[PDB]
């Protein structure tokens, strides 16, 4: 993806005006520095490889972390899958109106020992389960529930101390692209919710300890990482200026255009 | 000369005498839906002389203390002729547009407008916990207008209309990434934009989804000296291009 | 049992690797593709589109549309200065938040030329001539029009064509520069001066405005992707 190189230039005295244009046409001028001054011939070997949409987006970013405790009934986690709870991946995905990618999904699970009162605790390695429930399936209501059989719902099991688990997910959508913005309602009467929450139906993700609580409580935390592969992107969008406020909508409190200096001629 | 155009669509004609070029979309022209792209099975309606014609909206007044205006695009033409009657009887529909904003003043006036057409422009609410109601987001062929100040949070369901954030939380100078054009009163008189159909689905319901927004924002304010004409209007005419509809039922 | 031997780097999670992993939904049939207008393949197609730059940050203009208008009047002296700012596209607060300077804050290095377009939003009966200069570093900022004509300048005559382009060139000792503020890779200054006056007739307002745009040329390039310092978070968005 090599960039264009500059050609040599000579003094001119003519009726050709490359420097004079009209910006009211909505057209960006294609002038080069060899049209306004005398240049030499350089040949550039610089590439535009690190600014592709694949290289910009295909990096792992944390999207959530949730906790759950061993020594508790209904100590298990749940998360309704979205990408609008962190600030850094939300701003990168919202430079485009529509996107279409596959996923790669990594989990980082850790644990901590909680203040028990029994003498000489000694635990084995912990095993965790992460079950994915598509919209419409049965949900678990406690740790020893029937819904963790996983007859058709996909799940992973993982023992502590190994490499982190990792799956791959195709483009799972009803439309032809994912939408980051949606200017509309759910109802035909134009009441109720408004915005991108109408198009978000991706499922829930559950987490538990498979082991039973032996002698001390254990509090675990799982972090979820997203990595887009095979990316396509349409209709670029200006980058967000104000800080994000909520998850479901695009509300803001107004901020200045940039920071200020003391003069128009100060450097 | 490169300063004159003539656009003819149906039984309507637009002539202009000083103008910039015409901007077409993201490079593509509107066209009907193909067969390897479609998903609905019944046959579409293509009336195409009764709906693809220029409809003129109401006029707004450019004052000196004026901040901007906006229109939500398949909603302004929801009571316009046989285009708004086909939207009521059908469930689906897809449509490209051609927009002609026109504003004339003398050689003794000055000012500059940005005419931008932005897709999927979700607006923000004044109260940070709600979403804005429908009557604040759009009117039928009447302009909703920006403000030079900030709407208070005590208002429950309104649109945040601080003009330097453009209602969407961005920089208003960065809105030149969408298909846009300027009206400089020194050089220009009118701006013409041709937009294709942009969505993530091949057809959509035109009553619960506004997929285009037309904003007109004065960057350089209007000015004149005493004796010149104070009343300067702005007029917008929009014509659908290559419109088709599926799913005929009762009138809604 | 083929004999193998595991090397360092086993069972680690490096967040910028490139491997294959088993699918969780086997034989899934995806939605067919669609021709959507406006496909972007490279981020250097966004930076080549020009956006308006707020030269007028004067602490009561940043929360208004007055930040973008450069005031231009009819004087009684000659050789005055219109504006001036250093050419730091990712550290100076004038060019920091534009469409080019927002892409640059995701990267560490940059190189190439930079376009600066100026539009004269005055009356059609007003005239004027300006001097748009760029001076490489080593000396200070030019304090006169005489010091600014020794650099790379253009002389702009307003008329039917209302816009002019000042193209700053790539004059550097290194191949790349830093986006962050570095004195070792300083890039110089951009100033503007009155060549002649703004002469208006009677019953015409003598105070005009100028809009400024900034884009990138076809030899622009970026390197070493990082995280932007603009967005921030304390708790989860809920």
């Amino acid at each position, epitope marked *: 993806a090599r960039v264009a190189d500059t050609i040599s230039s000579r003094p001119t005295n003519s009726e050709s005006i490359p420097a004079l244009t009209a910006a009211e046409t909505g057209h960006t001028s294609q002038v080069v520095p060899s049209d306004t001054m005398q240049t030499r011939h350089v040949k550039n070997y610089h590439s535009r490889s690190e600014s592709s949409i694949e290289n910009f987006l295909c990096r792992s970013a944390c999207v959530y972390y949730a906790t759950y405790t061993n020594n508790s009934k209904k100590g298990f986690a749940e998360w309704v899958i979205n990408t609008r709870q962190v600030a850094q991946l939300r701003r990168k995905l919202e430079l485009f109106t529509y996107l279409r990618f596959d996923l790669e999904l990594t989990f980082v699970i850790t644990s901590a020992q*909680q*203040p028990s009162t029994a003498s000489s605790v000694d635990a084995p390695v912990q095993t965790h389960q992460i079950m994915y429930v598509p919209p419409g399936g049965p949900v678990p209501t406690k740790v020893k529930d029937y819904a963790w059989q996983t007859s058709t719902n996909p799940s992973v099991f993982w023992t502590e101390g190994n490499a982190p688990p990792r799956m791959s997910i195709p483009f799972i959508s009803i439309g032809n692209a994912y939408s980051c913005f949606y200017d509309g309602w759910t109802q035909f009467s134009r009441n109720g919710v408004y915005g991108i929450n109408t198009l978000n139906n991706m499922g829930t993700l559950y987490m538990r300890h498979v082991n039973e609580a032996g002698q001390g409580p254990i*509090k675990s935390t799982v972090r979820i990482y997203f990595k887009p592969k095979h990316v396509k992107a349409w209709v670029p969008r200006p980058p967000r200026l104000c*800080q*994000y*406020e*909520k998850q479901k909508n695009v509300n803001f*409190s*107004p*901020i*200045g255009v940039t*920071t*200020s200096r003391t003069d128009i001629i100060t450097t | 000369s490169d300063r004159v155009r003539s656009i003819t669509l149906g039984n309507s004609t637009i002539t202009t005498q000083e103008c910039a070029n015409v901007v077409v979309g993201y490079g593509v022209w509107p066209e009907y839906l193909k067969d390897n792209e479609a998903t609905a099975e019944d046959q579409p309606t293509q009336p195409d002389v009764a709906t693809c014609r220029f409809y003129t909206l109401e006029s707004v007044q450019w004052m000196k203390n004026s901040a901007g205006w906006w229109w939500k695009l398949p909603d302004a033409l929801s009571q316009m002729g046989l285009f708004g009657q086909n939207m009521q009887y059908h469930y689906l529909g897809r449509t490209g547009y051609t927009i002609h904003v026109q504003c004339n003043a003398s050689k003794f006036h000055q000012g500059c407008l940005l005419v931008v057409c932005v897709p999927e422009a979700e607006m923000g609410c004044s*109260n*940070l*916990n709600n979403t804005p109601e429908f009557s604040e987001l759009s009117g039928g062929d009447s302009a909703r207008m920006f403000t030079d*100040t*900030q709407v*208070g*949070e*005590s208002n*429950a369901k309104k649109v945040q209309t601080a003009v330097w954030n453009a209602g969407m939380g961005v920089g208003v100078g960065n809105l030149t990434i969408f298909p846009h054009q300027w009206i400089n009163l020194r050089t220009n008189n009118s701006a013409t934009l041709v937009m294709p159909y942009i969505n993530s689905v091949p057809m959509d319901n035109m009553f619960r989804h506004n997929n285009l927004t037309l904003m007109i924002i004065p960057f350089v304010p209007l000015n004149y000296s005493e004796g010149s004409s104070p009343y300067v209007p702005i007029t917008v005419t929009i014509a659908p291009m290559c419109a088709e509809y599926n799913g005929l039922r009762l009138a809604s | 049992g083929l004999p193998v031997m595991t090397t360092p780097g086993s069972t680690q999670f490096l967040t910028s690797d490139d491997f294959q992993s088993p699918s969780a939904m086997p034989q899934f049939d995806v939605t067919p593709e669609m021709q959507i207008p406006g496909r972007v393949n490279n981020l250097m197609e966004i930076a080549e589109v020009d956006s308006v730059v707020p030269v007028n940050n004067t*602490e009561d203009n*940043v*929360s208004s549309l007055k930040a973008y208008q450069i005031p231009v009047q009819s004087n009684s002296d000659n050789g005055k200065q219109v504006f001036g700012f250093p050419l730091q596209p990712g550290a100076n607060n004038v060019l920091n938040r534009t469409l080019l300077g927002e892409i640059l804050n995701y990267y560490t290095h940059w190189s190439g030329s930079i376009k600066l377009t100026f539009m004269f939003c005055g009356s059609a009966m007003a005239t004027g001539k300006f001097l748009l200069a760029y001076s490489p570093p080593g000396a200070g900022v030019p304090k006169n029009r005489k010091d600014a004509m020794l650099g790379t300048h253009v002389i702009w005559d307003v008329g039917l064509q209302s816009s002019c382009v000042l193209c700053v060139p790539w004059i550097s000792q290194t191949h790349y520069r830093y986006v962050v503020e570095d004195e070792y890779t300083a890039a110089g200054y951009v100033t503007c001066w009155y060549q002649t006056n703004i002469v208006v007739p009677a019953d015409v307002q003598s105070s005009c405005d100028i809009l400024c745009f900034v884009s990138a040329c076809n030899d622009f390039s970026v390197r070493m992707l990082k995280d932007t310092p603009f967005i*921030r*978070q*304390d*708790t*989860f*968005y*809920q």
Partner: antibody
Amino acid sequence: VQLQQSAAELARPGASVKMSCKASGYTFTTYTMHWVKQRPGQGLEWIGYINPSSRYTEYNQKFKDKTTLTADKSSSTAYMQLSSLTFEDSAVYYCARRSEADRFVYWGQGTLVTVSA
Amino acid sequence: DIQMTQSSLSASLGDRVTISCRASQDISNYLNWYQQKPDGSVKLLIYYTSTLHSGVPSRFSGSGSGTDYSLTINSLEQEDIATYFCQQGNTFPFTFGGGTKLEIRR
């Protein structure tokens, strides 16, 4: 990041007083700054805020005519002026910085304002 | 204005303490819990119905739905002897609850 308020004050009934909240460790014009009042026999009570980027203030409907909030972008300071001081205005006043939606993560230490003669 | 009704609870060290407050209408899981130390410093504990802020120990726990909410400390220590307010973020303006001060039993 911390917010540092001024020292305790004292005033006559009918006079005016001015507090302070010097913020450091972050960019001052990015977040709004809110003011909370706590009387010693009551709970906490919200007064108003100010947008430091545009100097836009919005008050509660009870403190609308007595309180005046102001700020400066130079010294990273936010002021609050109480006017027509009565004996109900003897409390502890906190400055807090609002975050994601309705959460105040960073608080000041409070100033004791007491009226007497 | 949403009335946020919460006065002084007593418990021994190392026991389970439960502080509750009740809204006037539905606030839709938008509740926050704060802690005011006896020297006068305030800090955020739980920034949703159940989500702990970073730097808060795992003794604290939040629950509730609709109108009735609660805050639980599972093992009382000497550092948790403070005043606890609850705050809603559903309607303009922000309303806080009254305090609830913890003290030693005997």
